[PDB]
Amino acid sequence: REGVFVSNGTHWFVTQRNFYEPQIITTDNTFVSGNCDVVIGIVNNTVYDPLQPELDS
Amino acid sequence: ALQIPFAMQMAYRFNGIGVTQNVLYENQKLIANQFNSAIGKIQDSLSSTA
Numbered sequence A: 001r002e003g004v005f006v007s008n009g010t011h012w013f014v015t016q017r018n019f020y021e022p023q024i025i026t027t028d029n030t031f032v033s034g035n036c037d038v039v040i041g042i043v044n045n046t047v048y049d050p051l052q053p054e055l056d057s
Numbered sequence B: 001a002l003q004i005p006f007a008m009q010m011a012y013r014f015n016g017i018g019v020t021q022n023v024l025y026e027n028q029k030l031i032a033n034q035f036n037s038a039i040g041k042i043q044d045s046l047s048s049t050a
């Protein structure tokens, strides 16, 4: 939504463009569009959905 | 200078005009071809038009 994806080598994070602040990738930090096939250089990682552990209680 | 991939710099340029950056990635080959062709037209324009 704002910022850019980065990896420390082992894990994937989203970060604001002008200061390194690594945050977990979530359905709040990110928006969907279309599917994997169209994007040049897309990568595979989990996106954590913050609602699911709440409803898992 | 901080390096950034050019297809990712252009996504920042698209957000800078209020076009959501998925519009670049979904059209990256088209946007690249329109840019390459437009630089083509500059050479033809300048080469002919004194």
Ligand SMILES: *[C@@H]1O[C@H](CO)[C@@H](O[C@@H]2O[C@H](CO)[C@@H](O)[C@H](O)[C@H]2NC(C)=O)[C@H](O)[C@H]1NC(C)=O
Binding pocket: A008, A009, A010, A011
């Ligand atoms: C990349 O970031 C992750 C998360 O900050 C690091 O994984 C953690 O590493 C510490 C030890 O350094 C462990 O105590 C945590 O349990 C780890 N968390 C997870 C979710 O695995 C990871 O080590 C970092 N990698 C690099 C190369 O810096």
Ligand SMILES: *[C@@H]1O[C@H](CO)[C@@H](O[C@@H]2O[C@H](CO)[C@@H](O)[C@H](O)[C@H]2NC(C)=O)[C@H](O)[C@H]1NC(C)=O
Binding pocket: A042, A043, A044
């Ligand atoms: C991202 O993950 C998907 C699976 O979730 C990978 O898709 C598989 O790719 C291989 C090789 O083309 C196929 O044999 C499988 O049948 C594919 N599975 C599915 C469900 O499509 C994909 O290759 C991964 N992409 C990257 C860039 O790592």
Ligand SMILES: *[C@@H]1O[C@H](CO)[C@@H](O[C@@H]2O[C@H](CO)[C@@H](O)[C@H](O)[C@H]2NC(C)=O)[C@H](O)[C@H]1NC(C)=O
Binding pocket: B030, B033, B034, B037
């Ligand atoms: C958006 O506009 C471009 C033209 O700039 C369209 O791309 C052309 O599509 C036709 C076939 O429909 C081709 O003959 C041209 O060679 C294409 N031009 C380029 C530069 O690739 C594009 O199809 C349009 N898209 C939509 C959804 O209207």
Ligand SMILES: *[C@@H]1O[C@H](CO)[C@@H](O)[C@H](O)[C@H]1NC(C)=O
Binding pocket: A040, A041
């Ligand atoms: C990045 O660099 C090399 C040379 O262009 C190429 O082999 C590799 O596939 C490229 N990856 C992407 C995602 O374009």
